Amino acid sequence: GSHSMRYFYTSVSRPGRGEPRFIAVGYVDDTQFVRFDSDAASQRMEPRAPWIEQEGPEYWDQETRNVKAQSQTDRVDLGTLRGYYNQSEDGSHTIQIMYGCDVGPDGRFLRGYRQDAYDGKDYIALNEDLRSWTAADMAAQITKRKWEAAHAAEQQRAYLEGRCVEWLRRYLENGKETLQRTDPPKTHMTHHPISDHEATLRCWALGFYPAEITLTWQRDGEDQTQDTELVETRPAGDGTFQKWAAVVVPSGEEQRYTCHVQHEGLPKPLTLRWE
């Protein structure tokens, strides 16, 4: 199937309380494989998947060097952006960066991404062609002109089409035993009377991987969004994911409902019902 590699960075200023805190995490699909936290003891990029432990000292030294320089860049960017928005020196602010690449099932480069945010909102983003930027506002337009004069899009495209996809393909090979698997959901339904004339039906999906899943409720074949409570897909903590969708139904009409489960790991989509 298709795969992705992504890096997520977060810098949070803490005026008076010292230098900004910097956190970096790396993922292949839904699997975390590396982390860096500026407040942790090691001061190094650390392995978070067994298949990356084998990388030699040169790998770890360069990755540490990169996340440290990224944390220094964000530290200067926190002051720059505070100035662009004419903000006080006392408030805490956040810069978030996401980047990475996707590969198809044949291993071809599909797409690359580089998106930056300020205080939880779009700031500047690399366009799909990897040759130009989209600035969210007037402040980001200043950044865009500096990034154009610096050939920043050319830098991103060179990484995304080169090092990003080549190392993603290497990781997919090194962690093949685990990254290529799909664990189908184990499904079941629960029923809870909520009064003498109404009941909750809850459709469960557990132990699945990748995280992508669709749970849909129908009444007499018609799609339900009336009473459909749907929780966010959540990690089990062992590398699998969980989700549930619930509907409120009239007592005695439970059999007019079905929950349809779609997941990549399922030989065929499932339909669940209360028996």
């Binding site: 970096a24 990169n66 860049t73 952006l81 700031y123 830098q155 991103q156 090092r163």
Partner: peptide
Amino acid sequence: KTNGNAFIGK
């Protein structure tokens, strides 16, 4: 592998 080629100030 992280990107080390674009530490360009905003």
